[PDB]
Amino acid sequence: EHLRELRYRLIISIIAFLIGSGIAFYFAKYVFEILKEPILKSYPEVELITLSPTEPLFILIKISLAVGFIIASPVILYQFWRFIEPALYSHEKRAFIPLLLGSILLFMLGALFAYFIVLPLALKFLLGLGFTQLLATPYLSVDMYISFVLKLVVAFGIAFEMPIVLYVLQKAGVITPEQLASFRKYFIVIAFVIGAIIAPDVSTQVLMAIPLLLLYEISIFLGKL
């Protein structure tokens, strides 16, 4: 039965996923403007053009999905939690609700952080480094950028979860604070691996990474038993 529950909770997450995608589809052209402002106001000379033959949808869809995972996270986190505790780890259920709410706001926070802190600071190191304006004007490619923004905004939105998800793991006794202090070095690559999978150059890869690592240090810090 431990095996069937997953097949009955996963479908509840994907089905809700398609609901947040259908709704977002309409707010795609809107959410799309948002993702442009950072560049349309900071560097108006920079020109973003669809190098593609006529693929403005590919961008509208990719967005309508990721962001769709943002508005649907409230259900996703719910199904997730209700599949592990009290299910298999915790027990009390008064600690369940606060888990949902917290994890919920932590998602919006994890989502806001990147879009308002990471992404902006990223571009600054991408083309905002010195008077290197001559090598970049009708050069900007919407894809590279847009694709970057989203992937970056999501990875961070989720990454933020590790804490709470790991916090509960420790309180239950599955993982001790020390076991992590010994995984510090190994995790460093993790943050540098994910940081390389979405960031173009070192400056960016390193940038975003640090924040995750740092937050991961908060988790262990919370290790107050």
Provide a quick synopsis of the model.
The PDB classes it as hydrolase. The entry lists the keywords Twin arginine translocase receptor, Membrane, hydrolase. By secondary structure, the protein is an all-alpha fold.
Structural description of this entry:
The two termini are 33 Å apart. This protein has one domain (2-221). It is built from eleven helices and no strands. The chain is 71% helix and 0% strand. It has helices at 2-26, 28-34, 37-40, 56-71, 73-81, 97-126, 142-159, 162-172, 177-181, 184-198, 202-221. GO terms for molecular function: proton motive force dependent protein transmembrane transporter activity. It holds the Pfam family TatC.
Q: Which SSEs are present, and which pair or pack?
A:
Blueprint: H1 2-26, H2 28-34, H3 37-40, H4 56-71, H5 73-81, H6 97-126, H7 142-159, H8 162-172, H9 177-181, H10 184-198, H11 202-221
Helix pairs in contact: 1-4, 1-5, 2-4, 4-7, 5-6, 6-7, 6-11, 8-11, 10-11
Give the key terms.
about 220 residues; 11 helices; monomer; mainly alpha; globular; about 0% strand; about 70% helix
